[PDB]
mmCIF file of C-alpha atoms and ligand atoms in Angstrom:
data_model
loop_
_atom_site.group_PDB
_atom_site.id
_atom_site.type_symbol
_atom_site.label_atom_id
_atom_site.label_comp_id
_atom_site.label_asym_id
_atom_site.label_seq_id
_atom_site.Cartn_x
_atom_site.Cartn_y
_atom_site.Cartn_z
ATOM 1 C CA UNK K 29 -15.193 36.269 80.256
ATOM 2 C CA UNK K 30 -12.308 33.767 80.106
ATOM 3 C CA UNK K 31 -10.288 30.446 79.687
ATOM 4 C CA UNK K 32 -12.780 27.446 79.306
ATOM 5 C CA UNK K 33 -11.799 23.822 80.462
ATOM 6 C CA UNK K 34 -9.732 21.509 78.323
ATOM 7 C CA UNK K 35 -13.186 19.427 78.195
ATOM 8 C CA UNK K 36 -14.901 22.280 76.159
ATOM 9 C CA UNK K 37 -12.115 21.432 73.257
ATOM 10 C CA UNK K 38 -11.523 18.022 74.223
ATOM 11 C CA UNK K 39 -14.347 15.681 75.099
ATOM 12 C CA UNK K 40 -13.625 12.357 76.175
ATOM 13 C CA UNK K 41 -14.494 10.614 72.749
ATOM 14 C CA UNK K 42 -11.966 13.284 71.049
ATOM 15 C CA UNK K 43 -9.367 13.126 73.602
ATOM 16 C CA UNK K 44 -9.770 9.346 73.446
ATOM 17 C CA UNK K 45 -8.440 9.505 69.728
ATOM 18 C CA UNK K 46 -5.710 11.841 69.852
ATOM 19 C CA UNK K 47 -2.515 10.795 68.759
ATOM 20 C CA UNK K 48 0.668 13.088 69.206
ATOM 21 C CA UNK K 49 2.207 13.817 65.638
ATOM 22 C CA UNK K 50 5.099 16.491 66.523
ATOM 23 C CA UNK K 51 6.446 19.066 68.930
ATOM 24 C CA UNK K 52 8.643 22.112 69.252
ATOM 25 C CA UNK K 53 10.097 24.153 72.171
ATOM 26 C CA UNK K 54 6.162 25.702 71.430
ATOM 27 C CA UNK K 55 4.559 22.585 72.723
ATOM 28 C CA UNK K 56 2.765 19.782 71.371
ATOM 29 C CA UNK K 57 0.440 18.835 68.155
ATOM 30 C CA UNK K 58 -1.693 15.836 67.988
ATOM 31 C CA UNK K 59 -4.125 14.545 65.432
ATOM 32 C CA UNK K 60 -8.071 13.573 66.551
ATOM 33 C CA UNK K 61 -10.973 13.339 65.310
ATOM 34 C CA UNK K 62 -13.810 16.135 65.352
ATOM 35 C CA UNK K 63 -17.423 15.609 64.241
ATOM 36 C CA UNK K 64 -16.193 12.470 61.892
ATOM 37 C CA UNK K 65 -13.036 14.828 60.250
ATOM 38 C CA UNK K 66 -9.517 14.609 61.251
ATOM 39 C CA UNK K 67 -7.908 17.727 62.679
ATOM 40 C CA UNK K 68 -4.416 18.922 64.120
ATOM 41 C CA UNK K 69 -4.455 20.279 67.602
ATOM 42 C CA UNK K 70 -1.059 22.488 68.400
ATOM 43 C CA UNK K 71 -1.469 22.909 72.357
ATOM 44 C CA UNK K 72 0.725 26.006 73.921
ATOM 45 C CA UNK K 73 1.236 26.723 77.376
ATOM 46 C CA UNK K 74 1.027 30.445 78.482
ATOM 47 C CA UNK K 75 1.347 33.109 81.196
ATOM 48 C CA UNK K 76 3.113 30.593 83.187
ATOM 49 C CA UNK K 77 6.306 31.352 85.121
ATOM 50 C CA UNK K 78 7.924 27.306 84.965
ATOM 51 C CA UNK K 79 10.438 26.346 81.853
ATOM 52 C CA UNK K 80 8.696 24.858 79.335
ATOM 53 C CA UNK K 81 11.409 22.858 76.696
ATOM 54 C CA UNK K 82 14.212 25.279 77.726
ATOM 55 C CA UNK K 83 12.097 28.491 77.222
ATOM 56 C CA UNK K 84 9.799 30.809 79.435
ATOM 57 C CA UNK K 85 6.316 30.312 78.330
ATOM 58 C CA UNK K 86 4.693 33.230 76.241
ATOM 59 C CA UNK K 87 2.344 35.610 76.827
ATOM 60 C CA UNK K 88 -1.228 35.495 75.259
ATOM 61 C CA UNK K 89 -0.076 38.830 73.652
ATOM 62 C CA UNK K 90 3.161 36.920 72.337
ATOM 63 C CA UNK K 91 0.704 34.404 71.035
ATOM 64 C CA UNK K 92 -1.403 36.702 68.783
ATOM 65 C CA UNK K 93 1.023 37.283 66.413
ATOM 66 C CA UNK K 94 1.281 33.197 65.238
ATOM 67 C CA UNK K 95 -2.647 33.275 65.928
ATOM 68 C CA UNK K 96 -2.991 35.890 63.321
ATOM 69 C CA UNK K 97 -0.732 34.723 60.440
ATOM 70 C CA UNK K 98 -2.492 31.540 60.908
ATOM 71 C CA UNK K 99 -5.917 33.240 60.697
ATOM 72 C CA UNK K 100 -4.634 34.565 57.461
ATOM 73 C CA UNK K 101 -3.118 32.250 55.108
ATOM 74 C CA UNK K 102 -5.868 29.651 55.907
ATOM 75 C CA UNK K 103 -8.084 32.779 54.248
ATOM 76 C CA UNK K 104 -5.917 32.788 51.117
ATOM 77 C CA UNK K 105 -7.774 29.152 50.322
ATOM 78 C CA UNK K 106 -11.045 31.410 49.991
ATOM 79 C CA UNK K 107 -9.290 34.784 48.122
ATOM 80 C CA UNK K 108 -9.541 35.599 44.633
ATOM 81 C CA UNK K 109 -6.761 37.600 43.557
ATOM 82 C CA UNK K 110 -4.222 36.325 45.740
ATOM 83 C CA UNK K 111 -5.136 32.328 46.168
ATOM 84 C CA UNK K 112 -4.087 29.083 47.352
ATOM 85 C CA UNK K 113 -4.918 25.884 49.545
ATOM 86 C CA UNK K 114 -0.901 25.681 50.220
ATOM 87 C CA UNK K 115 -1.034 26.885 53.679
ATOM 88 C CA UNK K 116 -3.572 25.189 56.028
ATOM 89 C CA UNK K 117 -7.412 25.676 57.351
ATOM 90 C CA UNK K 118 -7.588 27.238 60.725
ATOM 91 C CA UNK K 119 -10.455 25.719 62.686
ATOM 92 C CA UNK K 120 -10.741 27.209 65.727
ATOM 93 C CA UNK K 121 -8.381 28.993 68.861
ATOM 94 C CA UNK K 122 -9.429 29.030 72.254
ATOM 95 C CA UNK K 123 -7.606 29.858 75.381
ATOM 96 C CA UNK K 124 -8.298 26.736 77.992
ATOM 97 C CA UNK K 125 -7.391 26.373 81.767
ATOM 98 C CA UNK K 126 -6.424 22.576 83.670
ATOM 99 C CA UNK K 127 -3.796 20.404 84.131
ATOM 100 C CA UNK K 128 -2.778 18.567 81.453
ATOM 101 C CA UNK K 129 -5.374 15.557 80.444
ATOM 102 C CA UNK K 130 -4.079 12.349 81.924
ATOM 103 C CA UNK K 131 -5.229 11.020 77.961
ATOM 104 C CA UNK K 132 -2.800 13.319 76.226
ATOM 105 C CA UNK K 133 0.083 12.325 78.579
ATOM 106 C CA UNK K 134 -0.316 8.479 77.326
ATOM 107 C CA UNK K 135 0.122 9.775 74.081
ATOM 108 C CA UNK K 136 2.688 12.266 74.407
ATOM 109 C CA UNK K 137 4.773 8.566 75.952
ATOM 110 C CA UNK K 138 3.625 6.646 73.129
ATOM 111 C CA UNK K 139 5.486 9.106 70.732
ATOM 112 C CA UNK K 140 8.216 9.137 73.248
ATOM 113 C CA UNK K 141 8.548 5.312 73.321
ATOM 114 C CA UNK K 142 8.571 5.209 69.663
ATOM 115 C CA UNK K 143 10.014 8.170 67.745
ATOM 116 C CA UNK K 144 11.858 10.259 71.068
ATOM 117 C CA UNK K 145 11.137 13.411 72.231
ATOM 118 C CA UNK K 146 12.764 16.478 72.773
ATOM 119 C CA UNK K 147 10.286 18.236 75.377
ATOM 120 C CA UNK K 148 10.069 17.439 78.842
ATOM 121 C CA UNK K 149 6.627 15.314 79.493
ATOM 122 C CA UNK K 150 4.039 18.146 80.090
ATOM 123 C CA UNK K 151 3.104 16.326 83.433
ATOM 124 C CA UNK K 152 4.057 19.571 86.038
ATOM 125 C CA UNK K 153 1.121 21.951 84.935
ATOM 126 C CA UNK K 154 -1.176 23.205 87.503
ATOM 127 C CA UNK K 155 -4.814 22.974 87.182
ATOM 128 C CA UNK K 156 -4.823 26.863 86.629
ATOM 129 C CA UNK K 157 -2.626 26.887 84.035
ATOM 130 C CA UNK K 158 -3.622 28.218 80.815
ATOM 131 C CA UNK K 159 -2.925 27.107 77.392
ATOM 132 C CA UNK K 160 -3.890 28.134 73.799
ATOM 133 C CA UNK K 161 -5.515 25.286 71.577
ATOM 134 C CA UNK K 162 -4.864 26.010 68.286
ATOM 135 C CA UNK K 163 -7.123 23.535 65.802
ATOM 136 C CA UNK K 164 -5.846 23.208 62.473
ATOM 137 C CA UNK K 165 -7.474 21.548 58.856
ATOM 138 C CA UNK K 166 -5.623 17.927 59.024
ATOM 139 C CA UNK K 167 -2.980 18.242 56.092
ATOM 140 C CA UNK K 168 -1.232 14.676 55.826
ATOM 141 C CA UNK K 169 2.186 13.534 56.734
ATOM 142 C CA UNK K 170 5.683 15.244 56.860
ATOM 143 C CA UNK K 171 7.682 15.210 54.018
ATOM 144 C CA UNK K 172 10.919 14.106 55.952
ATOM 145 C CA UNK K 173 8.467 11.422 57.440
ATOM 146 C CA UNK K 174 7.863 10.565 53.830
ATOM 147 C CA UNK K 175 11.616 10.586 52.853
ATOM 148 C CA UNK K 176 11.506 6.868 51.597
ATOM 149 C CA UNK K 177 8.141 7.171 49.989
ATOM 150 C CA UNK K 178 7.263 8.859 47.539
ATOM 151 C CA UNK K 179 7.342 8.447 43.393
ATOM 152 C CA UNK K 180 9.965 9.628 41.788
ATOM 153 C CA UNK K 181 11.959 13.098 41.151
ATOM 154 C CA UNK K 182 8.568 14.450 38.876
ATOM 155 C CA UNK K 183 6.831 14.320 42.290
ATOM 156 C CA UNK K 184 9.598 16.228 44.069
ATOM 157 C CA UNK K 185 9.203 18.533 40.922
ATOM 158 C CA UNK K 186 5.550 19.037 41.900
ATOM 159 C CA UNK K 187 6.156 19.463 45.667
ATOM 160 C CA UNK K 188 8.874 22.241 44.661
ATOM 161 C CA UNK K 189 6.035 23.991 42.376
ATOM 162 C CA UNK K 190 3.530 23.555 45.228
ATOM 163 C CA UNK K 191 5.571 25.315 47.625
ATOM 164 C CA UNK K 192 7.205 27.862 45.501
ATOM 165 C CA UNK K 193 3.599 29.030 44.431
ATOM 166 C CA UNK K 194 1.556 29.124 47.861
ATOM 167 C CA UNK K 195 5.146 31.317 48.867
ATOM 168 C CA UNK K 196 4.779 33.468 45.824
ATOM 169 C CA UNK K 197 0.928 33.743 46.967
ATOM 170 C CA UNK K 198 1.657 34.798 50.379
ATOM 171 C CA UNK K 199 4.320 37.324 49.193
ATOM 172 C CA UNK K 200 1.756 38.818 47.372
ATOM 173 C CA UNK K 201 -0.850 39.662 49.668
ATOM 174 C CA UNK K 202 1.038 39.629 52.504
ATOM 175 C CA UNK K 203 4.175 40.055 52.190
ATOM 176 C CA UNK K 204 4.600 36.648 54.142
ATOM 177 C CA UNK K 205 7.960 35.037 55.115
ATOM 178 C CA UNK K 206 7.498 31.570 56.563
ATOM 179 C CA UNK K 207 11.013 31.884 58.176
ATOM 180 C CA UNK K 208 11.207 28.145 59.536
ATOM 181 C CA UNK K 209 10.652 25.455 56.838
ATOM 182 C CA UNK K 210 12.418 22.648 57.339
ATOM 183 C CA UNK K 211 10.782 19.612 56.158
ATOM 184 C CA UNK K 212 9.110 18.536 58.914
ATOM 185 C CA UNK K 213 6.997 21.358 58.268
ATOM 186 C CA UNK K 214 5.754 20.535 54.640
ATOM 187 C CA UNK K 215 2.802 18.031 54.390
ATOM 188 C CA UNK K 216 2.194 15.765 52.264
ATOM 189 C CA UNK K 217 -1.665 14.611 51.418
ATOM 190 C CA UNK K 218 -2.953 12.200 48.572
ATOM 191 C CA UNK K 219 -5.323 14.088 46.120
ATOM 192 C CA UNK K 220 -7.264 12.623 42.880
ATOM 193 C CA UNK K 221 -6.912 15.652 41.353
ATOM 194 C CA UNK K 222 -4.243 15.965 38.569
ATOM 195 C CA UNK K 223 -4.057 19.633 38.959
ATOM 196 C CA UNK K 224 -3.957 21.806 41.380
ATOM 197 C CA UNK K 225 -4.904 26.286 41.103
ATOM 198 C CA UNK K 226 -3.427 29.142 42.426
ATOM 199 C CA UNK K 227 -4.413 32.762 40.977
ATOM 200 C CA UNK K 228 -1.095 35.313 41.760
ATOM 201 C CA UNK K 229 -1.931 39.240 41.575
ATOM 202 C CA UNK K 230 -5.404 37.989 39.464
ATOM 203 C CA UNK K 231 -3.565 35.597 37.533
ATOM 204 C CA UNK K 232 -4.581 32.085 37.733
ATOM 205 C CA UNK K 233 -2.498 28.742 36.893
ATOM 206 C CA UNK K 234 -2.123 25.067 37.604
ATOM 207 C CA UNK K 235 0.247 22.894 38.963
ATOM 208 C CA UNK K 236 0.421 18.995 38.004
ATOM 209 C CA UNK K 237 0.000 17.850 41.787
ATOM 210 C CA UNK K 238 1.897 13.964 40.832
ATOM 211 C CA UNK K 239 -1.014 12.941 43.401
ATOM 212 C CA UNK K 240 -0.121 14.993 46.305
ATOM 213 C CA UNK K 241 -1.396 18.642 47.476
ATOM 214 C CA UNK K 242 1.153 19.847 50.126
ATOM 215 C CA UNK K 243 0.591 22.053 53.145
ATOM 216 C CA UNK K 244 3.184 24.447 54.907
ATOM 217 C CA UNK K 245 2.692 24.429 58.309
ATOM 218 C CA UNK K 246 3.850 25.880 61.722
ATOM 219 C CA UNK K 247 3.847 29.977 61.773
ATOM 220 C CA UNK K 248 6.327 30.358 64.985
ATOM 221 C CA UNK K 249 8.720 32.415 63.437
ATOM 222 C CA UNK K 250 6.775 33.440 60.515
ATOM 223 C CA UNK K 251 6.607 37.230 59.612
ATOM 224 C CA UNK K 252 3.576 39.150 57.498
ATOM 225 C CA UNK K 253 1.993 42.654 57.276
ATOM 226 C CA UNK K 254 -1.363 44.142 56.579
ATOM 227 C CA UNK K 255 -1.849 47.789 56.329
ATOM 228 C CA UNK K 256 1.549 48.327 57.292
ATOM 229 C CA UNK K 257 1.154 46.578 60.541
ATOM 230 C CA UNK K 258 3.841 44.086 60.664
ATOM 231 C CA UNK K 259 2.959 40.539 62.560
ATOM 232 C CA UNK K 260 6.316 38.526 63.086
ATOM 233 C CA UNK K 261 8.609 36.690 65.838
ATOM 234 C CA UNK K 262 11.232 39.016 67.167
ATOM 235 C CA UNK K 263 14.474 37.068 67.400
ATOM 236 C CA UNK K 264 16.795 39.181 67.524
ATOM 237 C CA UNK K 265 18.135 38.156 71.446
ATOM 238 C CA UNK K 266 18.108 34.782 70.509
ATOM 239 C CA UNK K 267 21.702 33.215 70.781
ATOM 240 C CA UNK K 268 20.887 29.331 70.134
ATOM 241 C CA UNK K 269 18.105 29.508 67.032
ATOM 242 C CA UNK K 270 21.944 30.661 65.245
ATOM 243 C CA UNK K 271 24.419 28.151 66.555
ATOM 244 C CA UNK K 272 23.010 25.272 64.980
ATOM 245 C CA UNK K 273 25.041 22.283 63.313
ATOM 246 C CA UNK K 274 24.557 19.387 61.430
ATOM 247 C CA UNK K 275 22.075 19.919 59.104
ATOM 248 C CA UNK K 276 22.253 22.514 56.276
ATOM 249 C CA UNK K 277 19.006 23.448 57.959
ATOM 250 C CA UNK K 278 20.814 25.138 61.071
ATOM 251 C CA UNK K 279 22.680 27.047 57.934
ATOM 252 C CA UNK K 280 19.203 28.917 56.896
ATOM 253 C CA UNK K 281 19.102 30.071 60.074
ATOM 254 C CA UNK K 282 22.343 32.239 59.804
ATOM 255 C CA UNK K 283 21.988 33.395 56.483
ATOM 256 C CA UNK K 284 18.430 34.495 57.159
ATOM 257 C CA UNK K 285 20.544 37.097 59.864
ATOM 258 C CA UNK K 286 22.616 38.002 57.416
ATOM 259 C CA UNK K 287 20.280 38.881 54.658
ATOM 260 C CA UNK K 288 17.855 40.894 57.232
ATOM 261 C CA UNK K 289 20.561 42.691 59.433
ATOM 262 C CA UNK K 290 19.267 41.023 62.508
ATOM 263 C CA UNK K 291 15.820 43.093 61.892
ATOM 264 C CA UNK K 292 13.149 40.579 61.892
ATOM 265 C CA UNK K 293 10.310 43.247 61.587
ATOM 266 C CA UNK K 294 11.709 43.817 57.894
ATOM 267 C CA UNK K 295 10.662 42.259 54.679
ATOM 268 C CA UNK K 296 12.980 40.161 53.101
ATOM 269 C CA UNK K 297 11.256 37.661 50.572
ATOM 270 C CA UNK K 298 14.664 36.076 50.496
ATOM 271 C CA UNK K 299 14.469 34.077 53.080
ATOM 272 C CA UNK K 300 11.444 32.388 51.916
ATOM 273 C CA UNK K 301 14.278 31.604 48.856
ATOM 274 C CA UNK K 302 16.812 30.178 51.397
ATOM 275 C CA UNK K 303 14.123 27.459 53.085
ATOM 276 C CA UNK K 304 13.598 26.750 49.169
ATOM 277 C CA UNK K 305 17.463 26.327 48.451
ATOM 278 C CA UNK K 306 17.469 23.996 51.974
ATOM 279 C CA UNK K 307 14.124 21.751 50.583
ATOM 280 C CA UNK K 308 15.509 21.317 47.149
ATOM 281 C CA UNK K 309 18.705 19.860 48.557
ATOM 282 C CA UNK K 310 16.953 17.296 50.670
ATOM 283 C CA UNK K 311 15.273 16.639 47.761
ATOM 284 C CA UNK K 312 18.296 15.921 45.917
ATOM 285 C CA UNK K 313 20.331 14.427 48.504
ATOM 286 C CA UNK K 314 18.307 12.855 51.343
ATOM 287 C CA UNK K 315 15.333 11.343 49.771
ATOM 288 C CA UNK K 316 14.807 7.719 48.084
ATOM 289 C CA UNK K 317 12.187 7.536 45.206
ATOM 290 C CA UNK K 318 10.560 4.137 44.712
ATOM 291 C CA UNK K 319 11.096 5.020 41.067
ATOM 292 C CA UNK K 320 14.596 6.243 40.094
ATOM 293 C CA UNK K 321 15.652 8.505 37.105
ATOM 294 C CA UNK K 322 16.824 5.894 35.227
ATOM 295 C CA UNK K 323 14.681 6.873 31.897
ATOM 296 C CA UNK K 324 15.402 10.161 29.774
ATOM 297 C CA UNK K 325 12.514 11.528 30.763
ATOM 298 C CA UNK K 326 13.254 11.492 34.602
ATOM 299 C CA UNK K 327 17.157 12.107 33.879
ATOM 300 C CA UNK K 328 15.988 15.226 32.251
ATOM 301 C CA UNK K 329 13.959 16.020 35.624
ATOM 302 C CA UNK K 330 16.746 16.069 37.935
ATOM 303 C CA UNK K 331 18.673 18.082 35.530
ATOM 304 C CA UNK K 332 16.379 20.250 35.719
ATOM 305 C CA UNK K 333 16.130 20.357 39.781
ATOM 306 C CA UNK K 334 20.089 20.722 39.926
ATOM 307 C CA UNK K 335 20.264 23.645 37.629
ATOM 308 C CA UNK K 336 16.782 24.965 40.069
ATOM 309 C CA UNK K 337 19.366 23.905 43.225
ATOM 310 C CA UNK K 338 22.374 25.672 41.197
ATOM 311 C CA UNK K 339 20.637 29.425 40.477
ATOM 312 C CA UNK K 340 17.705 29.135 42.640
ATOM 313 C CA UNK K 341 19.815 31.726 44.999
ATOM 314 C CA UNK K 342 20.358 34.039 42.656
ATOM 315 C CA UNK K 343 16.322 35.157 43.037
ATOM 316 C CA UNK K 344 14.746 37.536 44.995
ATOM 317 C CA UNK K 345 11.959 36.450 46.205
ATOM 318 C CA UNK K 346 9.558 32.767 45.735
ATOM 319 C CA UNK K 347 7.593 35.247 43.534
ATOM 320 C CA UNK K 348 10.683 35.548 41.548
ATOM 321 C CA UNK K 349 11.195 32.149 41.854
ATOM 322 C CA UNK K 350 7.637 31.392 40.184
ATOM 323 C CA UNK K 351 7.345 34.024 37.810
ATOM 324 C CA UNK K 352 11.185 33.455 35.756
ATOM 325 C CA UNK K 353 12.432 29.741 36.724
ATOM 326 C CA UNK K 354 13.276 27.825 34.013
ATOM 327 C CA UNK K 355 12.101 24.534 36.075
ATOM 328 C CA UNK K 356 8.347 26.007 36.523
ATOM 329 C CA UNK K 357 8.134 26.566 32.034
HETATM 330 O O1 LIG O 401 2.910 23.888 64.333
HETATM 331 C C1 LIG O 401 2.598 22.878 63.701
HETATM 332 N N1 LIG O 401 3.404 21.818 63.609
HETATM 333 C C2 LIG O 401 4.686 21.719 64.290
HETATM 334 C C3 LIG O 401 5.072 20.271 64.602
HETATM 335 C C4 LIG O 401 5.175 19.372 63.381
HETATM 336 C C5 LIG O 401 4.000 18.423 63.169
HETATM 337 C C6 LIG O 401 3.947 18.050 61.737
HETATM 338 N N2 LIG O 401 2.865 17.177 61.314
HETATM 339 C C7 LIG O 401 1.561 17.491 61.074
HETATM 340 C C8 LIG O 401 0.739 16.552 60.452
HETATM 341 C C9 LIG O 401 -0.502 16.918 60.028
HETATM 342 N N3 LIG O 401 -0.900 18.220 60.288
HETATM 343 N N4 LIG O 401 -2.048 18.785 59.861
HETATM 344 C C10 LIG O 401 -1.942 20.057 60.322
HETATM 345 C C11 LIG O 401 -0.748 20.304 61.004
HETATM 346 C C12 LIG O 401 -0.075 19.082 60.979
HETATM 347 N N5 LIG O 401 1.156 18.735 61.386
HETATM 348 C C13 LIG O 401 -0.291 21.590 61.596
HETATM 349 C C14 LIG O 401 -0.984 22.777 61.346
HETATM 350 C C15 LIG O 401 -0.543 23.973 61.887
HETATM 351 C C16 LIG O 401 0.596 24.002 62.679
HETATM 352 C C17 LIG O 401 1.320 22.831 62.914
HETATM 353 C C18 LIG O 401 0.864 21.629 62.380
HETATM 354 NA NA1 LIG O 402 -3.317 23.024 52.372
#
């Protein structure tokens, strides 16, 4: 039958080791360890009638949609035609019933105590209240956590590459739009391996990964279709997603309106072009590089990333993008 206890997904040891790494109106996502391997646990309340972060909680039929796109472009890691590791492994989902764990809470206020929140401490939920546990393949740190960190402009090259590809991948089979990716939502991982693979429509290539692999994260708004059966977040009520300011960020939002009428349900591969635009100027503008471009080499890099930043609009799609960029030749 139904919901199981938060115990059945969090046992003392694991609940014991969960830290909280981010939020959204959604919820909450903390990292823990399962059977000796890190994982990411995104926890959202639903079928509840109290506020949660300013919004009405969802239904589990509202739910299915991110449940499914995440279900998906975890599979591209194991595809053939259409493959990449640039999204992120999808565990497990389960729907769970309780009041919030008492061990989560003193997490959730350790993040508040040293980063700030934005939610309201989950501390009011019944112990009937359901929730779905979403657990995720760990995929590193936050690239806007990592502003100050990494290499040099090459590696901001790579991370460009990286996205642009598992984008062009996700067009391709599924005619994905990601529709929300600011920077907290790329991660950042070390790898030993100097190149990474994707194979588009059958045709494989590499990627010089500078040392990272990154992973695009958080499907809330995201849109895809199988079979003509279009999965995506309907927002075309919502007033405050488009009165945003302060970040060019709040920008995407508005333009993604504009290029899709207000009809979310559509396909429009542009978008996935815009969150591009918006990471390659962060890139350019809000990162520090332990190494700058002060060598011909690396002058010739960011050269290369302003004419990407200059044009890059002019594309239709991350497939685009891929395929005829000068930066990716
Ligand atoms: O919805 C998700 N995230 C939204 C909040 C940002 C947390 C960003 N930081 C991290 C750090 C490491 N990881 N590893 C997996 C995930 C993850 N997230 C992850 C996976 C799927 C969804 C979300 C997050
Ligand atoms: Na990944």
């Amino acid at each position: 039958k139904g919901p199981v206890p938060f115990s059945h997904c969090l046992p003392t040891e694991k609940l014991q080791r969960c830290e909280k790494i981010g939020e959204g109106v959604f919820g909450e996502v903390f990292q823990t360890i399962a059977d000796h391997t890190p994982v990411a646990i995104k926890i959202i309340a639903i079928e509840g009638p109290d506020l949660v972060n300013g919004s009405h909680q969802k239904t589990f039929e509202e739910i299915l949609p991110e449940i499914i796109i995440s279900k998906e472009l975890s599979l591209l890691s194991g595809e053939v035609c259409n493959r990449t590791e640039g999204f992120i492994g999808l565990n497990s989902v389960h729907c769970v019933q309780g009041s919030y764990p008492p061990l989560l809470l003193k997490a959730w206020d350790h993040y508040n105590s040293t980063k700030g929140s934005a939610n309201d401490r989950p501390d009011f939920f019944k112990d009937d209240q359901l929730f779905i546990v979403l657990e995720f393949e760990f995929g590193g740190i936050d690239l806007e956590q990592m502003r100050t960190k990494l290499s040099s402009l090459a590696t901001a090259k790579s991370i460009l590459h990286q996205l642009t590809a598992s984008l062009a991948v996700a067009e391709a089979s599924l005619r994905f739009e990601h529709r929300d990716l600011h920077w907290g939502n790329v991660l950042l991982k070390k790898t030993s391996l100097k190149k990474l693979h994707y194979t588009l429509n059958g045709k494989s290539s590499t990627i010089p990964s500078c040392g990272l692999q990154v992973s695009i994260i958080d499907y809330t708004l995201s849109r895809l279709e199988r079979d003509g059966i279009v999965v995506f977040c309907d927002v075309s009520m919502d007033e405050d997603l488009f009165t945003g300011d302060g970040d060019y960020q709040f920008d995407i939002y508005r333009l993604m309106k504009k290029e899709n009428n207000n009809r979310w349900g559509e396909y429009h591969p542009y978008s996935n072009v815009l969150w591009l635009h918006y990471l390659t100027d962060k890139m350019l503008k809000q990162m520090t590089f332990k190494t700058k471009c002060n060598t011909p080499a690396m002058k010739q890099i960011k050269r290369k990333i302003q004419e990407f930043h200059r044009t890059m609009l002019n594309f239709s799609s991350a497939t685009d993008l891929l395929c005829q960029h000068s930066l990716f030749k």
